Amino acid sequence: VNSFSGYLKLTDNVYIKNADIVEEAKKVKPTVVVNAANVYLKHGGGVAGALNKATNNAMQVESDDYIATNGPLKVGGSCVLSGHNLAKHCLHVVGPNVNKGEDIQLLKSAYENFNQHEVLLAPLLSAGIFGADPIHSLRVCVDTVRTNVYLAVFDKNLYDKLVSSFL
Ligand SMILES: CS(=O)(=O)Nc1ccc(C(=O)O)cc1
């Protein structure tokens, strides 16, 4: 038994809810929240900017130090940093950005990072401003992630479409 409430069970291990992932992170304080990162960890908008704003920019300050030391992530890759006031840890995962021409086949690699964590609160990778089809992102998630993943979908319209079209 864990602290996640109001989710709808899609599979043995994947759960989904209509909620802002930022708001969800503040209530639950999960062990791991996933950020929809880019390779530079520049958290300007979307999930990353909303998460970063909720940390009062501390996520960005930590991220800038991480990049100064390590250089950019890979598309499909991740790093574990602090969860600040939102979670114990933030898993920054880089899905391919379709609006930059990145290989959608990298979405599976991106979701494989989730398997290193027993339980996660996450958004749909490569959805929103990253330009991928969220229906596709949910299919890759279900077919790739084996650990317990609690997906937050902010758009109520999209949430209902994801559920009603789920195979
Ligand atoms: C409402 S918020 O901007 O504070 N935080 C969010 C939540 C979800 C998304 C998304 O694209 O799914 C983007 C930002």
Swiss-Prot record:
Q: Where in the cell is it found?
A: Host endoplasmic reticulum membrane
Task: Tell me where in this chain the Macro domain is found.
Answer: 1-167
Reactions that this protein is recorded to catalyse? Thiol-dependent hydrolysis of ester, thioester, amide, peptide and isopeptide bonds formed by the C-terminal Gly of ubiquitin (a 76-residue protein attached to proteins as an intracellular targeting signal)
Q: How is its activity regulated?
A: Inhibited in vitro by GRL-0617.
Q: How does it sit in the bilayer?
A: Multi-pass membrane protein
Describe its assembly. May form homohexamers. Interacts with N protein.
Q: What does the UniProt function comment say about this protein?
A: Responsible for the cleavages located at the N-terminus of the replicase polyprotein. Participates together with nsp4 in the assembly of virally-induced cytoplasmic double-membrane vesicles necessary for viral replication. Antagonizes innate immune induction of type I interferon by blocking the phosphorylation, dimerization and subsequent nuclear translocation of host IRF3. Also prevents host NF-kappa-B signaling. In addition, PL-PRO possesses a deubiquitinating/deISGylating activity and processes both 'Lys-48'- and 'Lys-63'-linked polyubiquitin chains from cellular substrates.
Designated name of the protein: Papain-like protease nsp3
Organism in which the protein naturally occurs: Severe acute respiratory syndrome coronavirus 2
Q: What is the lineage of its organism?
A: Viruses, Riboviria, Orthornavirae, Pisuviricota, Pisoniviricetes
User: Which stretch of the full-length chain is present here?
Assistant: 1025 to 1191 of 7096
